[PDB]
Symmetry: D2
Subunit: 496 residues, 4 copies
């Protein structure tokens, strides 16, 4: 059953994925504990969960946890390069989930996989389609195809024809559409022809989405402020045990791993530009400095810029260092931070990489389609581009996709367990509150965060991994600082 419907690269890798999962679980104590405590009561029993999140070994442990808790699951990855084929195979082999994911997907396949992951067959038999009850999302793509799908269906009935914005390769402004929008639109058009009630029909059983990353949260907030959010949402990124660990310490290690795999050069002594000094940029700079690089930071936020200066880093505008720096790393979550014009001024064999969620940070399309550009494959997912007029070259890591997952295996299990423990608690919260979702009276939906009590609990579940011994307050001390002995220990606005 699961093996026939799933689409993965190679089931024979299952045994290696299972063995890696067991090793990873030594450190993923949060997920191990949730399984231990809830596998028998099954709090998610009956829930249909669709996930769009990098299908790595760490993610396979998250999926296993959701399955042990009672959920039926369909999964896909949220990046064309981030899937670990042995991880995917492990899930299918054990019948833990129906999977549509493989490393090195085409953009078209990415959107077909996501769409298939959102498709559930009616538990009341026959050719009837349903949607998921809950969504685990990373970057907002599952949430995007749902909202855009609803928008397309309304537009479709209004003029009783395929909306023309779906049949054009051009933007409202005039420029060409990203390959991602063209592929999503192609899937949506196809669905308008199969069943133009598919998307609105899913709303009936949709109880929520838990969003993993900064960029996904930004998308959610924009929908919320415009009154367009169609389901309840939990912002997992902003849990303290997520944003202050995964984003920073995870990147401190996995950026280095991606660079070491993709870039042959020594980092020590090099001028390395980290564009953006937020949670991710802070971790990146720390790792880079740790191996002797001279980090130069760019920022638009005066506070973050001052923080960088306090760690001994030069803070400059890209234009003043573009011809002198050796390596450029984008960590902004923004777009057009490195343009083709910037790339033409870089020194011979400068390296460029992106660690933000989307490739838009770097003008990869402009680079690849520059007239007379010459490209060679240096190794898998590493390309050297040579301009025709100057004959100078730049080297780009994995077509500007998130380098730690494209050119390496992503963050290690410990921090992913902290982020994923938050995901499981978020999913449990949304599922338990499903009766409060009434699609007739209650039309307006919101984004919330998990409580500080749960945030502290996530941390407690990982202390033993590191042999950390926590101090206990006496009654006198607890009263003196005005906190309960069991916490929470900090006010809501505390920044850690």
């Amino acid at each position: 059953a699961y093996k026939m419907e799933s689409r993965i690269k190679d089931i024979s890798l299952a045994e290696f994925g299972l063995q890696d999962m067991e090793i990873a679980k030594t450190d993923m104590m949060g997920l191990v504990e949730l399984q231990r405590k809830y596998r028998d009561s099954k709090p998610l029993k009956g829930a249909r969960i669709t996930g769009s999140l990098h299908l790595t070994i760490e993610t396979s442990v998250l999926v296993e946890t959701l399955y042990e808790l009672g959920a039926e699951i369909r999964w896909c990855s949220c990046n064309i390069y981030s899937t670990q084929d042995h991880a995917a195979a492990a899930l299918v082999k054990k019948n833990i989930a129906t999977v549509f994911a493989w490393k090195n997907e085409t953009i078209e396949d990415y959107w077909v996989c996501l769409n298939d992951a959102m498709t559930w067959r009616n538990p009341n038999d026959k050719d009837k389609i349903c949607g998921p009850n809950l969504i685990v999302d990373d970057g907002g793509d599952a949430t995007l195809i749902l909202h855009e799908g609803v928008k397309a269906e309304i537009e479709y009935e209004k003029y009783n024809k395929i909306p023309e914005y779906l049949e054009t390769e051009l933007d409202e402004n005039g420029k060409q559409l990203s390959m991602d929008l063209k592929c999503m639109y192609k899937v949506l058009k196809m669905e308008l022809l199969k069943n133009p009630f598919r998307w609105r029909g899913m709303l009936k059983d949709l109880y929520g989405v838990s969003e993993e990353t900064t960029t996904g949260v930004l998308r959610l907030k924009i929908m919320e402020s415009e009154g367009k959010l169609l389901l309840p949402a939990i912002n997992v990124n902003d849990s303290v045990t997520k944003s202050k660990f995964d984003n920073t310490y995870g990147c401190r290690q996995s950026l280095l791993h991606g660079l070491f795999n993709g870039c042959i050069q020594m980092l020590a002594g090099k001028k390395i530009v980290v564009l953006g000094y937020g949670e991710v940029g802070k971790g990146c700079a720390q790792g880079l400095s740790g191996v002797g690089a001279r980090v130069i930071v760019t920022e638009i936020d005066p506070i973050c810029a001052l923080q960088a200066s306090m760690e001994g880093y030069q803070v400059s505008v890209l234009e003043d260092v573009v011809s002198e720096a050796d390596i450029f790393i984008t960590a902004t979550g923004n777009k057009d931070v490195i343009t083709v014009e910037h790339m033409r001024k870089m020194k011979e064999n400068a390296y460029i990489a992106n660690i933000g969620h989307f490739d838009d940070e770097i003008d990869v399309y402009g680079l690849e389609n520059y007239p007379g550009i010459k490209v060679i494959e240096v190794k898998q997912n590493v390309h050297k581009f040579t301009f025709p007029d100057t004959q100078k070259s730049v080297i780009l890591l994995c077509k500007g996709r998130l380098v730690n997952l494209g050119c390496a295996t992503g963050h290690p299990p410990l921090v992913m367990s902290m982020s994923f423990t938050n995901q499981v608690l978020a999913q449990m919260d949304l599922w338990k509150s499903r009766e409060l979702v009434d699609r007739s009276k209650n039309t307006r939906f919101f984004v919330k965060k998990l409580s500080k009590e749960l945030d502290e609990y996530v941390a407690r579940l990982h202390l033993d991994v590191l042999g950390i011994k926590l101090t206990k307050l006496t009654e006198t001390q607890a009263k003196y600082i005005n906190v309960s002995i069991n916490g929470p220990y900090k006010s809501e606005d505390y920044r850690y």
Copy 2:
């Protein structure tokens, strides 16, 4: 009227103020922008905050903006006498502060700073605004009001003021007994003093974590008697002063009071909050092996991610070499702990109050011998083991007691927030209705102002900020001019 150690020290203080101002851009800019319009014109401001060179620049700023000023320090050891002299010499403020005050004189200085006179018939008023660090000015006001209400309740001095024991049986701290002694003295002179100050009080802007805690407790109990602004929780304060300020000033305090090498030593940092994080970073920067204690599992994990062992004090007390309390809590290092420490272990506190260390218990231990090693450094020897521990400045904040506190740059960021806070409180004075509400709250400054403080300090360090294009601003959903982050952003 001022009470300071020596006015002849003024020229050194004035000279130090000018040098410091090179990096205190925020204060220099507020003086340039507002010395003519004078947004604080006529406000009576009482400050209770370490009177350092950095603080004298803050005082000069409030003065140039139009305020009348009375000032005292919030610690018996933190005043820099040359800074105090500079303010009196220039007649910028009336000062009651000196280095090495007795606890009795501390509370007399505070009480005098809160008293305003001249033909206003010819009697006592209170301040309009308070700049507070640790909450002592705010405490004496609230405890004063409480004392006056108890006084009229039974037409006699409240008995809790005339005892040496607390609501339990233990000795009251010397600070508490000296405050009560002042309140009793004021009930006899004028039992309407404290409540009389309320009609003119428009707010307090609180500098530190411990003072904010005090304010939040009063707020949750509905006992806050004036509007308050929490300056500690501005991003440009808590994430810079508390962290990077301590990273440098802790080391300075340790170098001045502890003769030993920090490299290789096991140094226990108790508390890994904003202060503790800065402390650990500076200690490691000079080769120490930092060991952390924490009650908060999130903070404990953060310490572990920086490569530090996280342990309970009882497991490392007999092996570690130096102990630094940074908790804002009480009884973190007890006399029983000190009796198990190795020979010549060093003990210091960087939290706001001395209560973190059981100094009273140590000083009153039967047969204890004490020797003064240098100014404000004492070696205590237990008579049974003959072992000694060395305590820096009687457990008072070591960076201000054994050194000169944080450097100008981070203080300018903290103090630019203070000036903006005072301006907010003063401009809104007409909104304070006493006869009606009597329900006050603690608020913070906006992110717009927080970002502004940072902008004012970028040129000091040659930082070049990038400008978003319209397309980029739209993409990340922010205005080109900020704010650039959501309210819950943690930096």
Copy 3:
């Protein structure tokens, strides 16, 4: 070259050639040596045999020797360290005859080394004129070969020690010795004057690493060294850069590829705090690990402490630590008994030259041990009695080259510029080697002038601007404006 080389796949050549060109952006010492000496050819006609990890960095070294006039035969000095695309690039361009591939058996390793040492003159066999050695295996086979020939002639039979699985005490010989011995036995049957015959034309060996230098010094002290030697490891621009900063980066690369776990907050034991250990520790702390050092040398131990690292004996932390990295160059540093006390899924790896640091043989042969392959060159071992497991990276072979790609080009260029200079020195003095009279050879090092020159060649890579002394300043500190700037005993 294609006709005789033994490599994995010639088709990988173009990837090797592209990587070499990218690498050359930073290997400016080798680039400058080629520019300056490709016409004069200071090594013209020299037959050079190399036994050194055949990486992309090594390919640039080999290309440099070739442009300088040498004929070359090469093999790797570890079964796991060859980069197949690097090997293919050399063969494809006809730069060298190569006997190397990633994942050789120990049998193939020794056969490859023997082939690299065999030069034909078309008929008769010859040896190399010069040897580039890393760890001393090429030097070892020569000396053991000579010893085997002498033993063979006095008793007129194959020496008994070459025909047994055991040493003099009844203990099992290492696989490396058995395989070396089987090669020497074969050569005695083909030509019992092979090894001795090579001495005539041998002018020297330049040794890359600490462990190999130890081997040379022992031979020198016993009066058994059969050729001049240059110790490259102890050039300042080698030992203070490659060994420390190279490992700071490549240890981490090796751990990231082989060990799935997060390094931050883990107790990571670095056994040995010499030039390698210092670099390992710095890299590990750089990513948040809590480093614990073991040492036998009180000076090195004190240095670790000054950097904030706990210094303990292995027995006191073996049950609590998470990861163990051996960087000693010694043996039996991690025994089977230590491994039986480790926590579940503890990781073990070696960064020293030889696998001897960890008792891999005892672990693999432990009665009832269960072994599972986690990924290429990473194995999980489970003890039958406790049911606890340990995870060994690349069977105890140097982890930065076995599980990753070794040091990056910049530091290798510095080490390799020294190697080329050493080779030139030995070849230029070939006429002064007298086999008849002076049969006593020594180990020497390159001059401080050449050492400073190596550093000068790499300054522009990192945009370093060097200050120039005024004539008055030069007098004051008593140095020449052009150096050397430091005493011979200066430790940098």
Copy 4:
């Protein structure tokens, strides 16, 4: 009393600091314990010229317990700790000629007096052994001999002792004029003084890089007049004192003399040798952005490998905030450089002599204005630009002039080498034959002793060494007890 010190009443404070210091100075404590009964230096007359700090007072005490008679002076006008000097005199441990803030004239008079011993009746002798730091004691001896020979050759005072201008005619340093004034006086008083000392002089042990260079120059020219031991190049000295000592004591000096925050500042470290490496590490540890200058391409690459920009001073003199000289060279910061610096740039030197900075040129610049900011910190303002620079302690080693120098642990390592070096020279005295050979050399202590010094300090830091098995010892070809490294090993 024959001794000349600031104040004997400070002795008690000095004695208590010595006892606290001893907790970490294990090497000196162990030498006292082991050799005080047998007294291996009994009868030796030792003259020391080395910064008279609390740490140095423990070295002197050690030589004294070992049987030596002692006379001492400091090797810098600002480095003496008066309580340390007082402690030695109070206990009769040594005759001392030292105080903090000496004039240059008094410095040379103190050194000359330290070199003068009485003959047991009314005549003088010299020392048997010299402990030197920077080579001034060694310098006055050789220049003394040279002046006596020159005096007898032409039956008059050598005119170079009365010129005021040097051989080139560019004005002698104040240090040279004062030394020459002493030598002129001693020629008129006893023209055989210096040569008469050679008889009983058995050696000098030199502490620092600059002093060793001076020894090496004399050795190479065949002019060295006594055996010498290079203590600086022991591994347990140069790799610990010079690097980790400065990492901490540079910061202490800067925090005391410079009010500004180091974080984010561009700080230039000129010279990246043993001292510079430690300075850079300390500065980075508190958030500074370190920029290095170097003449040695190897040292330059090392700096780059730690992430530091490496530039020539001319390319950064106008943008940098603070300048620290650690070269041991001269004229690395000229008056012309200082004129290009930004407003309130700070300048300091941590090398042995003040020559690294052109202090004479600055102080004598026509129309320069100078103000004392605090004790030993001066702000110089140029008349044409009205820009100012702030110089710490007139260019003298900042860690000892503006602070208390290195801490006890590393000084104990350096001083344990000194005692062993003194014991070596003393035990070899019969090999010094004036009539027979007359060519002397510089040597170093053995690696066995170098390792012993390290072993003596392991327990201070809780270090647990591993012991080699017999198989392992044979495998790496070393004795179980060491030494563990070849002679050329660089650590």
